[PDB]
Design a protein around this ligand. Sequence first.
Ligand code: JLN
Ligand code: K
Ligand code: K
Lengths: 520, 518
Amino acid sequence: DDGRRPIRRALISVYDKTGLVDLAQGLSAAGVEIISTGSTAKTIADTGIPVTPVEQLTGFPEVLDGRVKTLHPRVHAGLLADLRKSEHAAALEQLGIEAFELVVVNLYPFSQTVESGASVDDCVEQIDIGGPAMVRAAAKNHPSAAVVTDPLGYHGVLAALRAGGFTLAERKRLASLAFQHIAEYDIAVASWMQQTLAPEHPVAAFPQWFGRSWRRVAMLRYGENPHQQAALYGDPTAWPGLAQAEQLHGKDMSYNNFTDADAAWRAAFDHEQTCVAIIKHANPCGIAISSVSVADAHRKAHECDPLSAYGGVIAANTEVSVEMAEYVSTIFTEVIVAPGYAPGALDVLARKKNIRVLVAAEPLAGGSELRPISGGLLIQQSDQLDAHGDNPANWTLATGSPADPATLTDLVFAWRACRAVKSNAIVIAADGATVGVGMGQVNRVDAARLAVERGGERVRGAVAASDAFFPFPDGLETLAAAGVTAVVHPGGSVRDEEVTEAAAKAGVTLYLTGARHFAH
Amino acid sequence: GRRPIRRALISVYDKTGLVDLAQGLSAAGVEIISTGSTAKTIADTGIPVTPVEQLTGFPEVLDGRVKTLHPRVHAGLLADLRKSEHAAALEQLGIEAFELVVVNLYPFSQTVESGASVDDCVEQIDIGGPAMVRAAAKNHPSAAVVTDPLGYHGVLAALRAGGFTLAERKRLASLAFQHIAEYDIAVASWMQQTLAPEHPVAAFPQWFGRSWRRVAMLRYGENPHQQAALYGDPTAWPGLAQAEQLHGKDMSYNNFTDADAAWRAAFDHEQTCVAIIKHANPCGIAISSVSVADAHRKAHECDPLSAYGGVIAANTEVSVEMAEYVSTIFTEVIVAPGYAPGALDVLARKKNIRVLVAAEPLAGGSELRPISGGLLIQQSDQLDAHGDNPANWTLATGSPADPATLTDLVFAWRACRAVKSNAIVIAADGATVGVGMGQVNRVDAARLAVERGGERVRGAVAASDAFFPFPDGLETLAAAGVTAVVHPGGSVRDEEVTEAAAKAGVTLYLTGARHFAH
Ligand SMILES: O=CNc1c(C(=O)O)ncn1[C@@H]1O[C@H](COP(=O)(O)O)[C@@H](O)[C@H]1O
Ligand SMILES: [K+]
Ligand SMILES: [K+]
């Protein structure tokens, strides 16, 4: 047996009356008795459909401006009696109470009331008490009761009605969806109460309690490596990002595709000029800006390390042109992400069957960054390159002639690009493009040597940025000996003088920012 | 906005401090309305109790499922006494208000953790309890709701002061909704996983929810211009977020990520292991069949310059001998499952070193990786793939590895997980000697490992966390004198890489398992 229980009596109390009339018409036609609260009963009764008011059942009126209407045992006994138990079924009979097979409830629009910029009191008034009590009761008692919390499931109710009720398995599923809905509502209420109702004094950057939930977008083929299973989740209350990106072409997105596309997208939007960033398994192949075109930024970004760009992930901070798309079609690329594509650009990209072509919403300023650790979570403000020392007008010229406008643009480019590179990081750049990148080293002099080696013949006359201060002169000397003309670093070492003297001996322009951009 | 307490509604799972709370309330002339074991615990002391059935006048049915879901309870909780109409509605109905509500639930995460059956878990779902807490929290301008015995001292103080202030009632309301949120996340999670899983069952559920409690505000995040905080998951198995600090200054944000990385790297080996990290990067990792002090010396010797200001993790108790050597090296953090008698005193000679005690990690587990607008969740790389067992390795070329070479290969293979990709680990005698880390190009990682390894590379073994895309990466190792190399294989150019190892007389193993990490 499927555990089907024919629907005879339904309890309906909905804030949102979308699809209610069609649902009620279907239920009344099947001979289902509808029990409803005030305005739900009005909406149904105005159609000519008979309604049993909740007060008729309880003998107690709706009081305190709709605060205590259904918090009565003559409602909850019909919801909570476990009809698998002879004792519970007899108790309903002793009380003259009948069971509810269907419970249709949707909550006060608390999160919408909050988003509309409503007052503290109107938000508090939109906290539903009876609604969640009815949903939780019916969900707990799923072996007997079917609970529907979304008008999206109303046609499924009418189908179950035609089939002689919901199955036990269908009632288990409804109960799980219902408690998901309740946890989401509670998360919104508890978060708002902490932030607005009772904030700390003095106000702290991060609250004492933090809660979030996500909905699965897709199961992935695997995680970072084939032996690990993985899934993608979307935060429905968040501003759209990579998790909500629209896929226009290509095969399924892998786990590594999402982390690379996320890293590439953030690196491209770290620059105000037209920017293309190329990432391969979390590491930058090349990054470039352009005052000509997006195609020019892509060519220059690709030219940094063309070998590593094959199989890479491309992000553009502006619309991808047909010209860029033509060149991208000749290079093995796993993913391309952009805020848009020019007419005809997608067709050129769609020539290669596998490339994942994504459209993502431009990121927002600020925002928190979640970093799990064993047993907990670290939360910090996203490094948005907006520190006092990130503004070049606040930089200190420690030695050398001031940077000309083209040198300063390259220095600022290399400085901002250094954030995306894992520490210890050295970015050598020229004409708005990275030419040599020293990445992820425990030792800064190893990062400097890597940037010089990978930069090759393009290092002489270029500029360099260091994401943290040079602890010793050797890292800077490595750059100066290779022909780097201008270097920007945070400074802040007791040995800064020794590093500045080494730049002075080489005739290198040296800027001290007073801001650092460690990234792991 | 102080409101004198006259009537209290009490129903609690955790009976800690209940008798003292009730004695204080009865002495002030507060009427106590209670039910169940809470009512008996209070009544057995001689304190008078108004049972909920006397208030409601409704018979006990359905094993108590609806006893508090009554307007004689909820009208008293929900009447907005700021409204003259609600105060008069209460008088025309004959129902008195509640100024205090003391309710705490059986943590459902503990109901599921206690190993209760599906039927018992379903039976444990509290309806009335959360309804009472929610009602009083919503009606905080009139009602004070206490959901933790830790706030009972504050209740008695408020009682002496003529009630709680409006501001404290707002704070209690916020704390009450957090305790409801946490309860409902645990029921909803247990329902995705156990009550109503997908058919066929998926490795990760359709909905995922979690909450955390702030442990501390940090001085800053990764860099000074970023504000940050540390959170602990109270329903999780203890980790770095719950580590006990025995000595030193405040833990920084970077101290926690480094200590977390070090702890995981040390527990990636079954033998006594010490891992040293700096900037999420490994300075040195070593195993030992002698002592923890021997593993630390060998780990330190990999890159002693970078170990200065580093973070140390040991997968076993730190001895006095290890502590003596650690006291001569500038160290930011030391994390261990314990410290031998006298070891802490030796470490405490240096005022700043943060000395931590952490619980040993558990097998399996999910790894959370946020992305813009969402979250990636995957199984933690626990080095338990088919290809991680050396009996499942394929000898592509060369003579089989002797027992000492195979131990070094397995050590280098497992150590490669902790190194950010593209990673090359050169090792000898259970210790890393040269590490090529975080490169976009594998040949750059091979060159780095060889350069940093120096004179210790000739005769050593090497592991590659992903396949060699070209022979050059392997040739870099072979030309430096590496005798045996282990990598996943899986490239169309594997034969060319194997031919390059053959030409060099290098033993080459193909695992069929990869360990990318970022
Ligand atoms: O907090 C109060 N919420 C309660 C209560 C109670 O406190 O007893 N009963 C029903 N609700 C909710 O009232 C809304 C439906 O009511 P109407 O029929 O009046 O539209 C729906 O949103 C129901 O959820
Ligand atoms: K960086
Ligand atoms: K790795």
